[model samples]
Each structure stands twice: as structure tokens, then as C-alpha cells.
Target chain A: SNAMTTLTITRPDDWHVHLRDGDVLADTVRDISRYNGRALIMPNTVPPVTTTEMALAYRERIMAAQPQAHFEPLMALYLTDNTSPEEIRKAKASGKVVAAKLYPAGNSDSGVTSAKNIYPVLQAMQEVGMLLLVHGEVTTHEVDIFDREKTFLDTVLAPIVNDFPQLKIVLEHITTADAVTFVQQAGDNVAATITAHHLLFNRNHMLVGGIRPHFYCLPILKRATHQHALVAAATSGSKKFFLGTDSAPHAKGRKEAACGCAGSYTAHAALELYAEVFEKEGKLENLEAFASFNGPDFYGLPRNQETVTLTKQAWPVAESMPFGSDIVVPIRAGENIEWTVK
Target chain B: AMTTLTITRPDDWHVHLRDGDVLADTVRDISRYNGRALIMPNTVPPVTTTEMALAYRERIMAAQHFEPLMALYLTDNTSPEEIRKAKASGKVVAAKLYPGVTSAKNIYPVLQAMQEVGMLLLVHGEVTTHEVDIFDREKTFLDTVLAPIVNDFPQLKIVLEHITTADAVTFVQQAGDNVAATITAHHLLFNRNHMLVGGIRPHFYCLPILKRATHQHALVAAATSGSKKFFLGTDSAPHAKGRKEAACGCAGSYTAHAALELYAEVFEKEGKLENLEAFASFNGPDFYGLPRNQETVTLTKQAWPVAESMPFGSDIVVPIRAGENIEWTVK
Candidate 1:
């Protein structure tokens, strides 16, 4: 009953997103640039944007696509067993690289592609004051999908936080209470990013009546209890949490196939979707800081010079958008979302 | 350990033998491992009358070597008189109920009639309400729908079909001797993670959609605990490969390709191979008040590959553990 009719906040940034390469990039880059001032573009791609040169080239491609959109792309290096400490120095020296990601080897529940001792990599990031972003999951075949995020927080993140207290780690796209508690209880250098979809949904939305592949994403939606914790933490006005719409894209056919690929393409109406969750919790007051201030503050960057207004007018997200040769579906495709940012 | 195992030929307590053309293929595969099967009535229009069931049964009898125990589908229009007719027909062994969709008024008369005639009430046991989530539908039905039905009609023989959760296992285990359940091979071999985690697999998708791994572990423990309450029902639903692998795929796993083989893998893995005969052969017949088969079928620890797909009427259907090698083979 106390749901807000409107929310006006200083412009926000997406701390975590996957803006893929090639033909798909042409269509997806515009969706994120129009809404947010900046986004930390993920390096997970076909070959992956692992090197400084690759990240730079990828940046130019993303930049040239939307010259008039006035959106900034903050890039990160995909962590590998081979990612040298020297590259971390180069990344920071380049003044373009903001963070060096940490993930174990890939294709398991972990969703990471490369690993070695990330401690060596973490030391480099700390020495240079470059941020350490993490995917926040250690997926082994043995770990339950629901518990993967929790396990990563305890077994991996906690020790990393203690060992490198000055490393400034942003636990990316956190989806559980354990994650929230871990970040909040940790020092100021250990803030985490929250995905808008995780704040709004649980396992039920993706899998209550039918198996919906479109809502499926890495660090997959946990049970309703986990969702309750995420929603509360996002709206709790705790500075430890900020906005990161892990707005990944997959072809419509890729998502709806016999073995569907994981992801929710939420780049479209990213900020408006976050508002719906904040409004539902009656925490529209915290929306401004979570969306804009906290992210830039944690990254040691300046907030936007401009502001945006989210009206309570309900609107339908596009059912599908041109994605290369194939189309990609948005998270709430063909359904009404409560807020629309202008 | 004994390499050769011979037991009384098992009967499937629940199965889907689609009408007409699919019968030849279905009957051939099921009869390869089973001596009899309690066939469901939820075909396209459904076999709702005695004359229809008799005709359907006649086709199964003519098509294959195995015996077919038929069920009549219950609807809002299913009358007590119809129940009486089905029971008197000597061909109908049970009446099936799917929660919510059927007429509530018609269920009482059918339950009373089926109970009076010593016929079984085979239930799909999942609520079809939007208010309830899909994962909890079966447990919800046990609480909101079947609980009252069993409480009021204690003598009604009820077989909860294709049970997916520990909740269903505990319910049947605690209920009257007249109450029992069937465990599908797909549920025994997988969980929601297998279906949803890395890739959203449509084949592992079935109604009462494979729950969490804990629920799956419970089903395995119950089936292998040597309990007479839980027995074999592959719920081996077949849908075309096209029907599956769609935007919103149809529910059901095609397991008749090697139902018994799949269960054997589960039974042995749980360290309860000795308990298999009772679950596969004795309990089903005992619950139905039929005699255990005098005939014996033999199985060996022989490994074999299950076909990746099989002919369904016009299209090909993929089966459970498709293209995978199974440890047991019927001799």
C-alpha cells in the first residue's frame, strides 16, 4: 500500500554486465547505454577479453556503436591461470581498467573459465589499487546449484577478504543471504553488487509451473528464502550493496533449445526493473544511493552530473530484440513492469 | 554377488500406453521387461467409458504379449453409474484422478463406487492451481486434496502415481495399507539441478518436475528400504522429440525403453539389490489383490545401451537415459 508512485535518482551505473562481441554487440550495446551512465563490462566472451589489448579493442567497438549515447564502459580483465601480475600493472596504468576478475576454471556450476592462484592476481590488484571483482560462485559437480553462491562466500571470499584486506573486492551479482551477511559484516573494502533480477525473483519465477530458460542465469535463482534475503539486503540502505544488473544476452533459440543456455537479458529497462523491487519493499528512498552513489563511491569514481526519473507508469518490455542473426528475449518480456525510467 | 538374478515377472503399477498406433511400439517395449502394466486412461479424448476401455484393452491384448490392466479417466461427468459399469466390465482395474480439473461433485460418487467394487483410485496427485508453485504442487495436493479424500474414504484403494518428493513417500508410508505410491525412474535418477542448472534440459522435465536432490535421495531410500508401500511405475510418458525441446515443452519422461533396467541401477547403487523383487514383483500385485506371476524373468549385470530415441506414432521420442549405457539387461 505504501508503494511509491515515482522515484527520481541521480543516474546509476551497472557494475556487472556481459556485452558480448560481434553481431550481437550491435543490438545489445544500445539497451544498456541509454539507461545507465557506466557499466563494468564482463570479459567472458567467445575467446574472452582476457588481455589488455583485447579489452581495449572491445572498448573501442562498444564505444563506436553508441557515440551519441554518452555512456561510459569501464572494463575488466577475465582472470586466467596465466593472467600475469604485470598485466594487472598495465591494466591500472592504462587508466581504463577498473578491476581484475577472480574465477576458478570453467564450464561447471562455477561458470568461471580460468584459474590459478588468484592470490597472486589479488596482490597485484591491491598493490595497484585496482578493484577485485568476483563472480561469487565455486561450482563443483558436488556442490548443489542453490548452495554454490553460499559456498563460494565462505570457502573463497571470506579468506580472500581477510588475506587481502586492502584489495577492495566487489562480490559481483550476489544472490543469497549468506552473501549479503558476508559483505555487510566485512570491511568497507568488501562491498558487493546486487542484480535487479535476483532482487525481484526466486527459483519459482523460473521454475514454478514450467521450466523457463529465459529467467535462467549463472549463480541461478535460489529458493524463495534466498530471494527474501536478497530483497531485504538490497533495500536495507546498507552501503555494502549496490546495483549490478548482470544483464546477459543469449539468442532466443539458444535459450529455448533442448539444452537451453543460461542468462536473463535485462539490459532493457534495467533501472526501472530495480525500482519495482524497491517500491515493493517501500524503500524507494534508498533507490537513489543504491543506484548511483554507492557504486561510484565504492569504485572511487565520481557520480553522474545528471539525474533520471522513474515514473510509476506501467509498461511492457519488448518481447524480443534483434540479437545478431537471432533475437534475444528480455527478462519480463510481454509482461508489465511497474516503473519506467526517463 | 550373484551375477544371475531371477524373480517373478514384474508388473508396472502405472504407465501411459497411448491409444491406437503407439500401442504396437509401447506394448513391445514395456512387455520386453514387464509381464503386465496398469495402463492409464488420459489419452487425447481419454477412455472414459467401459466400452472404450475394453476396446483399448483389446488392442493392447492383440498387439503384444503382456497383459494390460485398464483404468477409466474421471471427469466432472464421470458418474457412479459409469464407475459401476467399469467395475462390472471385469476389464477396468482402476479409476484415475487428476487434481482440480475434474468436477468435485463427480469425485465422491466415483470414489464411493470404486471403493465399493474393490477398485483402485490411481491419482496424478498434483494440484493444477496457479496459486501453488509447480515444485510444491504434489505436496500441496497431498495436504489440500488427497488428505481429505483418504480420511473420508479409508477403504478406497489409492495409488499415488509417479511420486517425486520425500513428502509423498512419507505420506504413503504413514497412511493405511490401502494407500501406496509409484516412483518414476526419471525422478530416481535426477533432480531439479539436473534439469535446470548448467543447461535447462527439457527431457528431464516432467510433471511434479524433478525436485531438489534431497527429495530425490529420499525417493531412492524409500524405494530401496524394502517398503511394500512404494513400487514400480515408470510414468514413462512419451512425447515427440519435437514436442519436447520446444519453447514450453510438454511434461513427461520416456522411460519404457528400459524402465526395469533404470530401476535396477538405482536399486543396486543404494545397496539393496535383494529388495528389488518385492518392490518390482510382489508389492504391485499384492496391492491390487492379484496373484504374483508364477512365471519368472531373468536379469544379469549385463551392460547395454538404451536407444537414443524410439518410434512413437508418427514422430520419434527420446527415452530416459537416452544413449547411456545401463548395467542391467533382461534375459
Candidate 2:
């Protein structure tokens, strides 16, 4: 009833965020650590963190990058055709490794060529109670960029879910209305992470005005109807839909080129951006559960006890932030983010 | 040894000099380097009738310094009598068949009339059905639409306007003498990668959108092959900056600001400068049954920056490669 000025919730965890290796790792860890208690670090770096040993080593590097920060790094093994059921077990046995990422071939150079053939590895993940993080889209060259997500849902994802009812699957950074309905109708073991950018912008934002490389990401932004569907899913207080910034970082030169890479750097204002979406939908009350509780509950991890506050304050995100020697143009760069973490 | 290229003054076979307010600046910009241009007829309340087409031609002539070849818009409602009337008007050389109004059953009579009367049929060659992916539209249209038309109307002089794909190039080459295509500077220099790689470049966005690098290569080869079937058509439609840089941007790139200069760059880069004359000048006139211009326009190897925005009626239009340096300039 009254003008809401400040709100507080249990500190969130980025169920998905990329804390890249070496030079750029410090800024990414610090940005996510400022508000989040921990992050499920994506293992899509060069040569990829495909083994439990590599995942542990990568986690140590993330921690060493921001030594003073009290941020925990959860790791995932990069799933590939060559990845073994023994590797999945070894990854789960290592307490730090909680998930194994499944990227369709064309999504990344380190992607699984055929998820179907990796049944033993998936079975191992299900048996070990390890999460399967999926980058859900068909990599077929002929499939339209806009239609990849829906087609994946129909052809690949539905089959995987049916094959492994017990497997804890989180379809990461979903962009389509079809994805929302897919996650909604699936078993509780099957959930999804909704990105801040996907909720706030649609394909129109990336395409209509000018081609904005900053807003571009794989499973490229869908139409407004799908954007609205994402917003509804995120703010619906559904545990199946939680926060995963998919806060990937790419240097400006890499992104503003002839064939730019796919990703949007958003860890700088991840929570603030989520707050904006929730506030816009008049669903501010549901923000706490989606941002703080849903992810950890789905993964069988504990909810963060420490709380963070977001005041009704506005601030501009830097046009460019240091990415090693280069810099990344974050989503909402040079634009006002309506809420700020206090 | 040659730093300047002096060739027959070219004619743009397809271009959009939109109605009323936008006409003066659009006409002036396009007319600066060309001897003549075939003006498109898709505006608000399109120029469908002989009266409207004639009146629009008068308005364009008032603003243009060079000759303006007018085209009439075709609709399902357009009668065979209207086609004959448009043909009889010496000023109206062709009629355009836009994408959405295309249905073989409905336009058969109009096509028959245009064929019988020796009037050219200009086509925006992409299927407008939503089911077809944007990139596949041009290729699909070749199989489903253009193939049928080429088969059904053996004598129709069809100019596939602003073609953007390899399939379209191959289709035109394989089809009879009646089938020719217009190539744009944007399509010559860019592929889908240029439009989509960095950002969704709205300026690079147009109907029959840009395709892959292979398609771009085919277009470059066809243009430089010295084929009479392929000629210059900037398809230089302009939309205001606010309209283009908006939530739902309009299609079309504004290249009239330096159309010839841009084309020269493409020709020189391919080491096909010697062949540029036929593609730009002789082919267009030969295809349209008109005479090539007696005058010549020279392009020198001079670097110049294209304006970021230019006056388009009340609003400002952003031209292709806006604020960027162009290597060749008209002298």
C-alpha cells in the first residue's frame, strides 16, 4: 500500500555464472560475490574444465582471484562424448563438483556431440544425485536461430527428461515461451534458470533499433511474447524458475566484430536487474524465493542465511568494465538500473 | 596507372523515392550520380492507378535532376485494362509485384497482360509467409514462386529486384532471357555475417535479407561476370533514424547518399573495374529496352566519410556505412 523504498532477502546464489579463467576471473568473482553468497561456475573456458580435478583446480583459481571475498564457487564438469560414467562419479564424489554441463555441439567448441550416446554418463549423474545443466538448443545448421530453442525442447529435451525422470536437470538460461512451458510441465527434478537479460529484453531490443551485440546471447533473445513468458515464469515464485545470470564476459573487440561471440556480461548488476523485473511485474514479494531459495532447494543445497538489501536507488552501470587487459560492455551499460544493492 | 574510372553514366533499375515529403531529398541524393533510376511504387496508399502513378512521377520529376522511370504497384484488384493503360503510358516502364500480394491464380491475368504489352515485371523476390525462416525466404521463393512464374509466363520480362542469395543468382542465370536480376551494393559487399555478426545491423536489414558468405560470393561473381542479366539497383529505400533505430525498425538501407561510390569500391575490390560499365550502365538499359546514357561519370580513388544522418523530409535518415570512410568518390 505504501511506497516501497527498501527490500531485503536471503543472499542469492548464481545457479549459473561464468567466472572465466586467468586475467578476467577477479572482476567476475568480485561482481557476483558482492551480492551473491556463491555461484555455480560454468566450465566453458578454453580446454574446458572436464574433469573433477580440473573443476577443483578451476575453483581454487576463482577463490585465489578474490582471496579476501567470502564467496563459494560450485563447479561443473564440461560434459562431452568422451566423458565417462566413472568421471561423473569422480566429479560427484568431489563435494565441490555439483553438476555436469551438457552443451549441444554447435553451442561451444567443448560441447557434447550427442547427448543420447552419453546415457551411461547421464545415468551416473542420476545415480549420484548430481545436477545436469543443459544448454538446450539444437545445433543443426539449418535450424533458424529463433527456432532452435523450441525445436530442442521438442526433439532433444523432452526425450532426455523422459529417459531420466530422477535426474536433477536445470535447463540453463532459457529464452523461449516453449521453454517456460517445458519446465512448468516437467517433473520437479527438471527445472530451469531464467536470465536477467531474457526477462528484461526481447529479440526486438537486440534487433529492432540496431543490432546490439551487448544484448546478444546464445538461444538468442526470442520475441516479446516469449519475453513476457520469461518474465511471468521468473516472477511467478515458481521454484522451477530461479536466478541464473548466465553472466558471461567477452571483451569489447571480441563482441563488436564481424561475427561476434554469443553472451551478455551481467554479473555487475545481476541482482539489481532481477529486482527491476520483479518490480515491473508488481511481483516484488516473490523476488526473495526466486532469487534466494529456489536454486539451492532444487540442488539440495542450503538456503543462504545472510540477507542482502536492495533500496529504491538508481545507478548507472559502467559502459565498460575491465576484462583482463580488455573490457566488456555489460547489459544495461550506460543506462540506469532502477534498484541498487545496499 | 589509372586512378580514376570514367564510364557510361549508370541507371538504377530499382530504387524507392518515397511519396510526398521524403521525395525532394531522396530524389536529389539518388539523382546526383545516376543518369536515371526506376523509382519504386510502395508508399502509403501505393501508386496503383495510372493517375496516381503519373501524378507521383510529376512530383518526382519536380525534385529530380535526372530522368525518373516510374513503376506502378500491382494488387489482386488491378485489372488487365489497368495493366494495358500503364503500358500505354510511355513514362511508366514497369509494374512491381510486392511479396504479400503474390498469388499465381490472382496475378496470372496481370502477368499475362504485362507480357503481352511488353511491360517489365519487377518483383520483390521473397515469400512473405511467416512459416518460412527469414534467411530461407529468398531461396524458398525461387522454388515455389519464381520457378512457377518462369514456367507459366515464358515471355514475361521479370526483373528479380535486389536479389540477396546464390539461389536467386543461379535461378536468374538458368532461366530464359526474360529472367534478369538487379544486384544492390549492400548485398555485393556484405553477407548475413556483416548484418548479424556484431549487432543486428538494422541498416543492413532489408527485404530478402542478407544471406551467408557463400551467397555473397555468388552475387559478387555474377555481377563481375559481365552478364547482361545482372545490373545496378541500389534498392536505396530510406527510413527516418527514429523509425530505423526503434522497437520495430523499418526495412531498407539508405545508400543514395553515395550509391556509385559504394558500387565502385565493390567493383575495384574484386579487380573487376573493367567490367563495371556493363553491369551499371549498358545492362540496365538493354534489359529495359532503353538507350544507355551518352554522358559519363568519373570516380576517383578519394576517401570520403558518409554523413551519419541526412535530411529525409522532416526526419533524418541513416545511410549505409554511416559515419564511415568510403574509398571511392564521385568526381
Candidate 3:
């Protein structure tokens, strides 16, 4: 006789997530597996996983961390100017490495210094049926921090999107209205991954009252107008937009310091946070296609068969959770989350 | 263990005791350690007339125990006759010029009248052009707007209210004796990094917004050098917590909660405690041609936790260093 308050959807896949190496792997794997069945793990580690061999070894460490969790770890190769076309074909033959990432220099570990020099690598990915994931931001010092994403689109991404019509590109963790428009109008081969933190909060949440180091991340939150645009895109029922929580974890001390790092820890309650956003927008019916279907379909993989149920139960996230030798703070730490999973 | 230091009761030359029920709370917090304050008139219906200034003063006095020196909000409509009336009334001590509210050239006559009447000219030293990057407004104002005003009225006593740049410090140093500046305690302690590096802290936001670390070091040098041109002005404007922690937060840091204690921490940190009395108590009155306070206020070098929020009318205001410990306390 009770109205439906539980949503059971096919287990979702995270197209972009950072499961750092070392002792934190077990806790990170457990949280992601609780809600998601697969995740495309970023390869921008200290000694980046730039080859198929490296990714295979990294995947074993992840599987070793949680043997009973029933989760699959998809791997990516780090793109550099020196990467050869042969390496891209080799990655495709392996079947395990499905993508290669491009980070503009100074953005992360040994990122591509010159985009023009990587034409051969992008061409290889286009023909080999592999995806190209880009950290879409310009590293020019003169550009304002708030305008980096849009500048990247105009100066770097638009040309690449035009030159390689068949290449599948994912503008990872987009944060602006410009990025949304670019993805909406581009070819079906071009899409984006939106994060829960970007959809729920804007620059004001990070900056307005006090300088909260915890709300800080790269492609720094934009104005409220940009936030509204992200919400619309995420709930628009568009196949081009899907779930990718860029849940990079840094220790608590690292974030609350004089100069904080550029990431947020969202894996702890990734699905719950997304549920809050979708429900608030009156678009709960569209959540399944976003979290579960769209991601796998865009990546040319099968939709996850297993189902996960979300109950309408409120739970508070811990202020800090164990991260290897130190602790990391999640997005909604010390705050109430209205939905929980079993 | 406690350390104590006492000095002459200080005055806040620039502050906003916004009118309405919030008056009681604002007045109480400011009067906690100060004997007098130069109340700003930039309220909803600004205090633009002599009668309004006196009436506003009466309302402020009814709510607390402190001397209120009023300043008229200047406009093109303000007459020289009103300036004479305000000076004769003796309750008005200064006139504030907000750059963009009225045309800059239109206020020359008002400046002339203010100069003749011995009233201080307090300027909100920031250009209000929408296109200018906020971080560069103060320097722009100093270079293009303020330089001309000082040149035209060399005899007028000017205090660039709450200056946040090394460029401003250099300008005041090179200008005539009549030109001076008020350095807020927050500006001395924080830089752009504090407000921006880790997160966007709206609480530290204010007019003539915080500048780079180099400017902050320069301000500390000016305030601690025992310069007569540099004096204390909290600019302790209070905005309700909801108003501050919003999508578009207001610009103010309410330090009236522990005004002198905050200043004490800065001076003590710079090892300039010996010069604290003149900067906080003496310089302001001397610049304004008013008498210094004979009474005293004491502070102890001890840590005290600040309330995260305090009553502001029906709402609440979040003070600077809220829920955090201050190294000094008014005792």
C-alpha cells in the first residue's frame, strides 16, 4: 500500500575516477564497488601508467585489494608527445586498455606539452576504437582562472573535434556553460562526463563566506549561471552526457593548507549525491539512463546486468575517513545525505 | 599565563552602524572597546542632510554608550550651504565621497566647501568600473581618480579609507601633509591569497579588496612604522550571515566583535606594540583635528574563542575569525 520510495537501477559505471596507488586502494575500491560495477581509472599516477603493461599491473593491484567486491577496473594510458602509434594499436589488442588521456602541461604528471605533436597518437586512437579523454583546460598564465575551461574549448578542443571526426572524445568533468553547449552541438562521437560536485555547488559555495579549502578543485567552480546549465545538461535525458565522478582523493592536511591541491573526494557517496541533485530537479525518472545506461552505451560497452537499490534513508557522512597513512574528507563530510544504498 | 597591555581608548574613523533594529547589536559590539566612531551614512536613505545626520546620531546614541561622529554621504545635489550648516552643527566631522555614485567632476564645489569648513574628506578609494578586474581597482583609482582630486584641492584633508595596496602607501607618502590613509586590521593581517588561494572566503571581502602579499607586507610596514598618516579604521560593516554566505555575498568583515583585540594581535605580531597607542588612539583624532580620549582600554595577550554567529536584529552576523581563537582579548 506504500508509495514507491526506492529506486533500483542497473549498476552504474564511472567513466572517470582516480583510484590512487598504495594502501588506500582497499577503502577506495570498497566504496566504489558498493554503488558502481565498473570505473575507467585515470592513469595520471606519480609514475604514470603510460603503457598497457603498466595498466595491467595496476589493475592487478586493484583486484588484489578487493577480490570479493565484484567490480571491474577499466584502465587508461597517459598520452604524451613521444607516445608512438604502435603503442595505441598494442593497447587495443590488449582489450583491457580502452582509452588514452591528454592533460595540458602543468595540469598534472608529465602532461602533453604540445597538442600538435600528438596528431599521430590521436589518429591511432580514432582508428583503433579507443577513446580520447582530455583534461580540457589551458595552462597559459595570462588567462584568468575562471575562464580556463572556455579558453581551452576555443583554442584547443574545437580544432581537435573538427580534425578527428571519428575519434571518440570525453571532455572530462566539465564545469562551464560553454562546455555544455560545446558537447550538446558536437558530433555523436564527442561527449562529456559531469561530476556530482560540479552539479551541486558553484564557485560561491567554495568562495563566498569563507575560503573553504575543501570545496576547491581545478577548473574552479564557475558562477551560478554555469551551475544551472550543468544541472540542465545532466538531467536533460541526453545520451551525450553521463556519470563520471572525478573523485580524486588527497589527504585532509593537504586540502586544508595554505595552497590546496586540485581535486575533491566524492567516491564515498557518489551515487547518493547524484540522487539528491536529480530528485531536487524533479527528474528522478531520468536518473537510470544517466548513471547506468548512457555511460556504457557511449563507451561501446555492455550495460551492467547487476542491479543496485537506493532506499529513501538519510545518513550522515563521516567528517574524515581513513586514507592509507592519513585521512581524506569526502564532499559532504559531516552533512546529511538523504539516500542510501544496500 | 597572561600578558597585558593598556593604551588610550581608540576610535574607529570608518565604520557602518546600519540603521534599524540591527543598530542595537552593531552599536554594542563597536562600543565594547572604543570611545568614539566615525559613523558612515551610506544607508538605504543616506544621511545627506544636517538634520538627518543629527537624527541618525540620536538613534545611535539611544542604542548604546559611545560618541558618534557623523559624516554626510556626498552627492551632486549636496550644496555648499549644507556643508556650512553641518560644520556649524558640530556633530558632523567629515564628508564621504563614493566615486561612481555621482560624477567625479561635479563634486569640486563640495570639496571646496568641505576644505573651507575644516571637515575631513573620506574617500572610498576604488574605481567602480564593471570591466576592471576587482583585484586591480584600488591601483586604478589611485592612478586615475585620486591623483586629480588631490591636485585640485591641495589644502583639503583627505583620508583614503581602508587602503589595501602598496601603490596607495607610496602615494600618501609622497602627497602633502593633509593627505593620509586609514589601514584596516584585516588588510594588515590578510592578503589576496587568504581570500582566494584555498577557497573564496567571503568573510574577508571588503571595499578596496585585499591585495597581493606584497601589498599586505607594505601595509604592515606603514601601520607599524609609526606613520602619522596611517591610523586605525575597522570598516567593521556587519551583514547578516545569510547575506554573507550567499551566491553573491556582500563585502564586509565584521570585526567589531573584537576590534581592538584584532589590532593588538597585528601590532604584537609585527613587534610594534610600542607604537600601538599612536596608531590606534592618537593619529586619527590628530588628523581630524579632534581631541584624543583621556580614558584607556586594556588587552591581554591570551587566546579567546570568537562566536561563530551573533544576534543582528532578527538575523545573525558571522564575525571575522568566527569559531576560531584570537590571540588577544579586550580585558
RMSD of each: 3.0, 10.1, 11.5
Output the better candidate (2/3) by TM-score: 2
lDDT by residue (A1-342, candidate 3, tens digit) is 123389898888888999998988988887777768899999988799888899899999989887346588899999987899999999889988999999888524487888898999999999999999999988775555667899999999999999999999999999999999999999999999999999998865664334556777876777778889999999986999999999988887666542357688899889888988998899988999999999889899999888889887788889889999899888888878888865
Interface RMSD of 3: 7.0
Error of 2 at B58 (Å): 22
Query: Once superposed on the true structure, which residue ranges of model 3 sit more than 4 Å away at CA?
Result: A1-4, A106-109, B1-331
Residue pairs of candidate 3 with colliding backbone atoms: A207-B200, A208-B202, A209-B202, A210-B201, A211-B201
* Tens digit per residue, CA lDDT, model 1, B63-153: 8647889998888877789889988988799988875345455578778888999989998888776556667789989998898999989
By DockQ, the candidates rank as: 1, 2, 3
TM-score per candidate, chains pooled: 0.92, 0.63, 0.61
lDDT per residue (tens digit) for residues A1-342 in model 2: 123488978888889988788888777877888878878989888878989999888888888887436578899999888989999999888899999999888535667888777999999999999999998987775665667789999989998999999999999999988889989999889999999998888765664324567777876887677888999899999889899999888887766643457788888998888988898899999999999999999999998888888888777778788988888888887878888884
What residue pairs clash in candidate 2, if any at all? A211-B199, A211-B200
Expressed as tens digits, the lDDT of each residue in B1-331 for candidate 2 is: 2398889888888888887798889888878878898988888889898888888888888875488888888888888999899879888999998873757679888889999999999988777664455566778888988889889999989999988888888889899999999999888887765665324566777766776777888999999888999999998989887666543456788788888788888888889889989998999899999998999988789887878778989988888888899888774
Q: Which candidate is the best by DockQ?
A: 1
DockQ for every model comes to: 0.59, 0.09, 0.07
lDDT score, candidate 3, position B14: 88
- How would you class the docking of model 1? medium
| DockQ of the two-chain complex in candidate 2 | 0.09
Residue B141, model 3: Cα distance from true site in angstroms: 18
Residue range A67-153, candidate 1, lDDT tens digits = 337588999988877777888989888888898777665524223453336668778889999998888877677777778888887
Candidate order by TM-score, highest to lowest? 1, 2, 3
